[PDB]
Every structure is written in structure tokens, then in C-alpha cells.
Design a protein around this ligand. Sequence first.
Ligand code: A1AK6
Length: 167
Amino acid sequence: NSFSGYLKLTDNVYIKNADIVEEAKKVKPTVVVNAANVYLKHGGGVAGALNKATNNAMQVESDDYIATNGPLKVGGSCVLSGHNLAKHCLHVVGPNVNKGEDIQLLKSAYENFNQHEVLLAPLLSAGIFGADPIHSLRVCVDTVRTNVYLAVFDKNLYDKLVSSFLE
Ligand SMILES: CC(C)[C@H](Nc1ncnc2[nH]c(-c3cnn(C)c3C#N)cc12)c1ccc2c(c1)S(=O)(=O)CCC2
């Protein structure tokens, strides 16, 4: 868990302008969070990038999990191997509001983080999932009670988020 260059927002939330994949390779965290969908199909975005860094091992493991257990619920999670990125990967499904899912499920999604003492995570439901990223940071700060290190791979958005938090 050798996180470097993060800015501490609250006693348990830290943030950095960084690619979560590069962070996971350098830090070797106990847990890395994937921004998953309910069938664990890592087709693009954060999930595709994490799977590619495992050379597709994450996708094969995910398909076997879904065969035995069925899909996740929106707001839910499962723990699978971290492969070369972490000890464990926490696959968390935030709502996709561009596909009509309820933004109130973002609180449920972040509540999954509280079962793990330390996590490297992306900003849930941001990007093409369509949630307002400033709102997602506020739900993270108000919900997560364990130690979360957020990697946001866009300097423009990182600056907006920090300036929103410090108002
Ligand atoms: C807001 C945005 C800046 C942020 N992106 C990221 N945040 C942190 N580490 C990242 N690595 C990469 C990366 C690394 N390689 N490649 C080819 C990619 C891609 N794509 C992207 C990325 C973000 C946060 C949450 C979500 C998404 C995007 S989404 O659009 O994938 C939908 C799911 C929820």
C-alpha cells in the first residue's frame, strides 16, 4: 500500500491525478476496485483497462464467477483475484444513469468499500456511466469510512474535484 503523491481530502479519503492501472502496478494495493457492470463484461473504460493489464485473466475468472453465481445487482459487488494488480479485486457496480439506473444506488455502491480496510478505486459512475463526478465525490466522502485512495485519470477533472471539495 505504498501510495504516493495523493492529496488528503478527509481523514479517510485521498485523491490523485493518475491512471488506476499504473497506480495498481506501482502500489500493489491489497484491494483495487473495478468499475464493473452486472455481468462482469470488461469491454472498455476502466474495467477494460484493468482486464487488459491482467492479459485477460480477469475476464476468464469473471465469466466463471457469473456462470456459477449469476449476475450482480446494481449497487452490489463481489471479491475476485487481484491478479498482478492487487491481492484482491472488488468488482463494484455503480448505477449507469445514461442507461436509466437510479443515482441513489451510488450510496449502496460505495458502501461495498467499507468491508476493506484500504482500497485503490476509481470515481464510481463517472465518465460514460453519466453521474455528475462532483456528486460522486461527495457520496464517496459521506459514505466510505475505511481508507480510500481515488485515482482520477484526467487533470482537468481532478482540478475541478479538488476545487469543489475545498469550497
Ligand atoms: C472520469 C474518468 C477520467 C475516469 N477514468 C479513469 N480513471 C482512472 N483510471 C483510469 N484509467 C483509464 C484507462 C487506462 N487505459 N485506458 C485505455 C483507460 C480508459 N478508458 C481510465 C481511467 C472514469 C471513472 C469512472 C468510470 C469511468 C471513467 S468509465 O467511463 O470507464 C465508466 C465506469 C466509471
